[PDB]
């Protein structure tokens, strides 16, 4: 058994950190729902 606890609202924050790149990858998705790098 699991339980949920509220973590906040779904809102866009103007003063948000900007980070992370934008890679372009060829990937395969198998029947089990796992992504694979191709």
């Amino acid at each position: 058994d699991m339980y949920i606890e509220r973590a906040g609202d779904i809102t866009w924050e103007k003063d948000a950190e900007v980070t992370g790149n934008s890679p372009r990858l060829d990937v395969a998705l198998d029947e089990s729902g796992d992504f694979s790098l191709v």
């Binding site: 949920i4 973590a7 866009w12 924050e13 990858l25 060829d26």
Partner: protein, 153 residues
């Protein structure tokens, strides 16, 4: 059952453990299949039972059909409202990458977070959830790149 982002908790480990993230919208709770594996969730004195799921999409709805229909424009920046275990929800702006597959392309965010962060929503500038975070690959640098997982309503 109020709208917003919720933590998926469980006392089945050493104690309080956050297994993933979820989004409640229009009375339906949206998380990723691998987080709950369809298990029923407790919302206080009331329970929530799975309504729809697809292991391939790694998504699952509760109390109703999938309600998230917003899509990334493939152009604008978006924000990952990451919810790490024991850490306050933080908005992380970023520009999605591309997962190039045989069935088309999908957005991907190159953000690395604890395993318990699976299911944290990804927002557009308008505030609409355009997908869920937690299902991706690990790139060359040991990085983690999660796909912008979105279902059909």
């Amino acid at each position: 059952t109020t709208d917003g982002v919720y933590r998926v908790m469980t006392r089945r480990l050493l104690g309080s453990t956050q297994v993933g993230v979820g989004v409640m919208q229009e009375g339906v709770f949206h998380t990723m299949w691998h987080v709950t594996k369809g298990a029923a969730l407790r919302s206080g004195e009331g329970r929530l039972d799975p309504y729809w799921g697809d292991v391939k999409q790694d998504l699952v709805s509760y109390c109703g059909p999938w309600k998230l229909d917003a899509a990334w424009d493939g152009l604008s920046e978006v924000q990952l409202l990451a919810v790490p275990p024991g850490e306050r929800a933080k908005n992380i702006q970023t520009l999605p990458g591309i997962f190039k597959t045989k069935d088309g392309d999908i957005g991907a965010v190159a953000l690395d977070y604890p395993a318990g962060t699976s299911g944290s929503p990804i927002l557009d500038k308008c505030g609409r959830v355009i997908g869920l975070y937690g299902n991706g690959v690990v790139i060359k640098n040991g990085s983690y790149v999660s796909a912008i997982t979105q279902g059909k309503r």
